[PDB]
Write a protein that holds these residues in place. Structure first.
Motif, short mmCIF file in Angstrom:
data_model
loop_
_atom_site.label_atom_id
_atom_site.label_comp_id
_atom_site.label_asym_id
_atom_site.label_seq_id
_atom_site.Cartn_x
_atom_site.Cartn_y
_atom_site.Cartn_z
N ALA A 65 0.34 -1.26 -0.25
CA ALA A 65 0.10 -0.02 0.11
C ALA A 65 0.96 0.79 -0.51
O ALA A 65 0.41 2.57 -0.56
CB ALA A 65 -1.49 -0.15 1.34
N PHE A 102 -6.43 -2.75 -3.48
CA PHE A 102 -6.22 -2.75 -2.13
C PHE A 102 -6.29 -1.50 -1.96
O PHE A 102 -5.14 -1.13 -2.36
CB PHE A 102 -5.17 -3.57 -1.39
CG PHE A 102 -3.89 -4.10 -0.53
CD1 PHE A 102 -5.09 -3.92 0.66
CD2 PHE A 102 -2.91 -3.13 -0.24
CE1 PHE A 102 -4.47 -3.71 2.07
CE2 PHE A 102 -2.50 -3.56 1.08
CZ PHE A 102 -3.08 -3.85 2.29
N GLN A 148 -6.81 2.38 0.94
CA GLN A 148 -6.69 3.35 1.89
C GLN A 148 -8.15 4.03 2.88
O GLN A 148 -7.80 4.93 1.38
CB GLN A 148 -6.11 3.78 3.36
CG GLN A 148 -5.04 5.24 2.28
CD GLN A 148 -3.94 5.04 3.23
OE1 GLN A 148 -3.55 5.25 3.87
NE2 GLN A 148 -2.27 5.54 2.24
N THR A 159 -12.10 -5.79 5.93
CA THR A 159 -11.53 -4.37 6.24
C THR A 159 -11.19 -4.27 7.41
O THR A 159 -11.68 -5.15 8.99
CB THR A 159 -12.76 -3.49 6.27
OG1 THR A 159 -12.05 -2.12 6.04
CG2 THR A 159 -14.12 -3.74 7.18
N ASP A 203 -5.84 0.60 10.75
CA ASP A 203 -5.02 0.39 10.96
C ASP A 203 -4.20 1.51 11.15
O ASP A 203 -3.94 3.06 11.00
CB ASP A 203 -4.27 0.47 9.54
CG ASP A 203 -2.42 0.24 9.71
OD1 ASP A 203 -1.50 0.17 10.44
OD2 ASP A 203 -1.66 -0.41 8.50
N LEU A 212 -8.38 0.36 6.44
CA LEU A 212 -7.84 0.04 5.19
C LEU A 212 -9.25 -0.74 4.47
O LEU A 212 -10.49 -1.90 5.02
CB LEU A 212 -6.72 -1.68 5.44
CG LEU A 212 -5.27 -0.40 5.98
CD1 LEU A 212 -4.35 -1.89 5.96
CD2 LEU A 212 -5.23 0.63 5.13
N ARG A 260 -10.10 -4.40 1.78
CA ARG A 260 -9.36 -5.89 0.43
C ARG A 260 -11.08 -5.83 0.07
O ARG A 260 -11.79 -6.65 1.03
CB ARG A 260 -8.49 -6.21 1.07
CG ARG A 260 -7.52 -7.59 -0.20
CD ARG A 260 -6.46 -8.29 0.59
NE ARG A 260 -6.15 -8.70 -0.08
CZ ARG A 260 -4.88 -9.93 -0.14
NH1 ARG A 260 -3.63 -9.97 0.69
NH2 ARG A 260 -4.39 -10.60 -1.37
#
Lengths: 396, 396, 396, 396
Positions: B64, C83, C85, C362, C365, C372, C374
């Protein structure tokens, strides 16, 4: 502990930062209009105004509307922050726990001072120099405060309470002992340039609006202006310079002062151009409107082949002073969502005594059997008015 | 009359502006989160939809971290005003009164249609050309609508809600009769330049931020690239150009198309620099990081000694088309304090579909026995996605 | 918001893939007998259409014993993802949120089309080619659509659900206007090879299985024969070839057709070995058992000193077509982890018509104060019958 | 699953065979009358009738009721079979199971089409030849559909109910575009014979009965006839010939046509005798009863020293046509016993749109841990009027 942790952490941070940030006060707060902002970044314009002598008469028909306004930019970077791991023996009891968060807060508060203290000495524009050390002896030693009072009074520029003076600690003792210590004040360094001249005669104007590429109008930031040179080797930002024939004028009656003009350099560009402060708007040209003339500071054009000279001729630690509302601190609440993702307990907080805002967050780490902890403060600082920030030096 | 005046004035303004604005109805409606106030405008930033490299498999690690994000500007000055006296014969009864407000509102709202049309026709980047006149069923004639879908669909730029097309009324009848006619559309004009050449090999990147003079970081809009040429010899903003030997890429698939790459010029600088759109990111350049290469547009860098040709050697009325979301209207409610001051009246309105906010206000005058009225609308428009606004030059 | 996010997000992903994936929609869905399992990569075999000799009579004795069966492999790789944020301003409200799921889903959808489109156009074995360019109504120009029924009907490779056709947009315009646009199709490229010739007499036959290193028996996919030649250079995969004096047979009738047989090359090894499709099971090879001979489709053994010739001497944008059942997409649901780890959220989902499956997850982070997300799809695609995918090359 | 298997099998077989039988469904469906003809093999006679013009006048004794009617024989051979084993993964669920039966049924249908098409092409008796390829040019090619109306209409044979034509798929394209196309039509081949002659004078009659070995009376298969010729080498079944001199007559008026009488050879006997079709019943012979002379075809006896010439000197894929009701397909329910044996399961079915009958049988096993299936169709086909089936050839 019982999950209370955030309450003790903000209690330490608020109390600590309020105590230990003296030079971040003695400067003026400002805000967004409604705290509504949520994007990754924003850009703010803000206004400045030059005072005008009061009208006398029983009732008035003139000059109620005032004169041409100006604005200056401010921009906010990524936050300053601290990031560390809580091993559990720091978490065992309150009077142990306060130690860690306080040490982080102190480590962080250092940067809030260092940024403004560095900025003033680089970006400022009044300069005073004597080929002497500072001392208390009335004979054959110089007094800094005596000239630093006189140079502002003679400009008419300081007309308010709170004009403030700062010393580095190894000089603060030499002078005996509103005045303050700071350990954070930087060193300038000796520039190498010689024989420098402008080329082609030049002049400059205050301006309120110009076009953008889409076709709309924007305010143009008036703090600095471009000058072009015969050479540009051997100079760096934060240096100090003067033009040989040129003198300052007082803001109200517009008489010439005794001493030469002073300018301060903020960027060097393409081997050819330099950006300098304050913008040298001149009296004694017919081209200016009656509004535009009101912002003249300087006795002449920047004439062709003017000799350009270095004032910072040999290097030492700085000392610094300013009139009130020359420097501002700007901030917002941090964009974040509460009570959404389970993996990251977080809270906002504010520091009303200094106008900063920030965020506290924590998460448990499988890799170390420990809590991770993060604190961030979002703030931006700039001089609004380079005409009002001054630097002294011991001799050369 | 009753003192009801405002209830008729807003009824006329809302209805008449709704009927007379055929083009502004088909930009995208939008709002910032802020609430800016009259002495300090905000240069509010906005994002464009992002792209990234393909990323495959289980156990994905820190991948990322390299992700990149981009933004574009929009700007606002003081609002448009109209401001006039109500004589008493304009103020007898409803069917006489309406006329006045309709005359003001027409004179105001016409400025908005002129803005979006003139901005698109000047600034846009897709170009289509035929030596023929517009016509049908005839091999001597050329058809605009087919090429105006094909050139843009083959770039993968179209979304789900579909395109829109605007003809000028002189051409429209020749095509017979999604598709609309508008009176406001300008003529381009012919340009004298020839023998133009690029001056040396140039190359470009998308960019996240650059440094402010104060030392902070600011976002930079990537719409405009500086290009340096042999002597610019009378080029103008709104002209259209193509470089020899370079071709467009499909945005998602990255394959080359057949036809020449095409560019639009927005500003001229110092006789040897020009500002052009869109920014020509190459695919063949080794120098990009893979997270940057995701934005590629052109088959090669703009190599040394490439010839320019001018796509606008003879001139005619324009015709214009765009993809969806390629133009935005930005507006904010006007700050005024309802019932703060007694000696005045004001009320707020917001035209629901075109998205313009507006203010109505009225005041007496002891000096002329007459009411004053003042209406204002606050708005700005910008070329987001300049890659997807297009212009046709028939009869060249 | 309330952390309901998944119940909106999948209802965007399903719909926003469904509207823009035509080359996926015209492939044919299949399933293995299993329900799929995650950690290991996982080859799966499946059967082709069978053939068998004629067998008249009231009595058959043991004549079922010799029946010969064939299979092919699909080989699912590691998953396909996107992927990123979630900044927090993209999560303020529903209509602002949808746009991010669309921006991700479009990049995800594009990769599926590019896979099948490239695979078909690169691998396929029927070549239609012409010295002229595409057009209509003109004796000096050629029409693709008729020949792309005629070749298939002549082989009797046809099927009930009917064939389907694609054009690239640069050619589709010239055909006027089962038949579809697509932006995605590749470009073939010119091969430098010449004077290529076969190094020694060869012939081939189907085989049910072969011995593994450990002494067990495992299946062999019959698709990819191998041939040995005089030295070869520049024959990159996806090229197209034919042998002098060799002709195709109809699948059921075994009559010989008029035109040259054609083959497609898939790897190069050692500069003197290649892998090619389809496997040319020759009629009139005296060595075959009749149960093997039923799969034959080519008029002779590959004799010694045969001249090869090359079938793509000038390169331009291709286009592609297939019989029904020629391309198979394989996927099944991934195993779920509902509430298994407390610091995470996830669900499985499926796309009911196009037949793909995937997983949404999800996480919060602390490294970036962000959620995040995915999204991942797991699918494999393969040509099940290479005789049935055909490619156009105009303008030779 | 659940023992229902037989229902899905007939639901596939009935459907798919009816969709992929374009030629066989243009022959006439026919049946013997009985519902109970269970004997394990049989031969079936059928009558043939020649049309007669509707009579005029108030009452009739001109020819009336008693007539020389004729019969022809067809012999039902052994069934067609398909016979295979059901592995376990072919029997999982309906959408998989249907594939196996569908593929077997297709494979089965191919024999029915190939039988009628091959029989018609090799056996037929009208022949058209032009030393050209097929094509639409005015004076540069040959126009097959014109000749194959002219040749029949000038005989007056196909006066009512019309006719059907079939092309091979390569010739159909050159002709542009009652009429149909099929892949399955055979190549004839070239024959070596030369200088052949009639060996001695011969002539023939229509007949109703002749004696069997036991002194009973039976019909006489009145299609074939025997001729003796000078010694033959390289004649083969399905070749094509014409004698010197002889010319055809129109059926309803006995006018001579211009072109040569023409014949087709069905079997070589001992290098000295041949069987040919149709039977050359001559006009201009006194050895005929007034009813017998009604069936005459040709203008003279086959006299001594008549030369033979070959009408097949170079070879290509055929084309074929026929008058309606001149090929027939015959079938009956299969003789079998249901629930007489407990070890084996079977059921009987029909294909209404073609008139075919069939049987489905499935059996368990110990030898292969599997099920066995065997499907069978019983039918026979014949040229029940060989005077009416015509063949066309491109040039020599």
């Amino acid at each position: 502990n019982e999950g209370q942790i955030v309450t003790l952490a903000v209690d330490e941070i608020i109390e600590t930062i309020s105590a230990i940030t003296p030079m971040a006060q003695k400067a003026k707060k400002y805000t967004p209009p409604a705290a509504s902002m949520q994007r990754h970044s924003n850009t703010i314009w803000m206004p400045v105004e030059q005072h005008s002598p009061t009208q006398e008469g029983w009732d008035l028909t003139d000059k109620a509307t005032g004169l041409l306004e100006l604005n200056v930019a401010v921009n906010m970077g990524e936050p300053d922050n601290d990031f560390f791991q809580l091993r559990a023996d720091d978490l065992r009891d309150e009077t142990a726990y306060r130690r860690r968060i306080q040490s982080a807060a102190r480590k962080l508060a250092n940067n809030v001072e260092l940024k403004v203290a560095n900025m003033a000495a680089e970006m400022g524009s009044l300069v005073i120099t004597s080929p002497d050390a500072i001392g208390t002896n009335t004979a054959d030693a110089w007094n800094f405060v005596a000239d630093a009072e006189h140079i502002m009074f003679s400009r008419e520029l300081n007309r308010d309470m709170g004009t403030s003076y700062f010393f580095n600690p190894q000089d603060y003792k030499k002078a005996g002992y509103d005045v303050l210590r700071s350990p954070k004040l930087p060193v300038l360094t000796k520039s190498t340039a010689t024989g420098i001249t402008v080329s082609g005669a030049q002049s400059f104007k205050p301006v309120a609006w110009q076009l953008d590429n889409d076709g709309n109008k924007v305010n143009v930031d008036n703090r600095f202006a471009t000058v072009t040179l015969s050479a540009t080797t051997g100079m760096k930002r934060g240096d100090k310079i003067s033009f040989a024939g040129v003198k300052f004028l007082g803001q109200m009656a517009k008489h010439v002062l005794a001493q030469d003009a002073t300018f301060s350099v903020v960027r060097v560009v393409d081997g050819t151009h330099v950006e300098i402060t304050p913008k040298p708007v001149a009296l004694d040209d017919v081209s200016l409107s009656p509004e535009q003339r009101a912002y003249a500071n300087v006795n002449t054009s920047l004439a062709d082949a003017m000799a350009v000279n270095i004032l910072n001729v040999k290097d030492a630690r700085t000392n610094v002073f300013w009139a009130d509302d020359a420097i501002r601190i700007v901030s917002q609440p941090i964009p974040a969502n509460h009570e959404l993702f389970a993996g990251m307990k977080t809270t906002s907080f504010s520091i009303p005594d200094v106008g900063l805002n920030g965020i506290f967050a924590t998460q448990g780490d499988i890799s170390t059997l420990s809590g991770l902890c993060r604190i961030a403060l979002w703030y931006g600082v700039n001089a609004t008015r380079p005409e009002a920030i001054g630097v002294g030096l011991p001799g050369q």
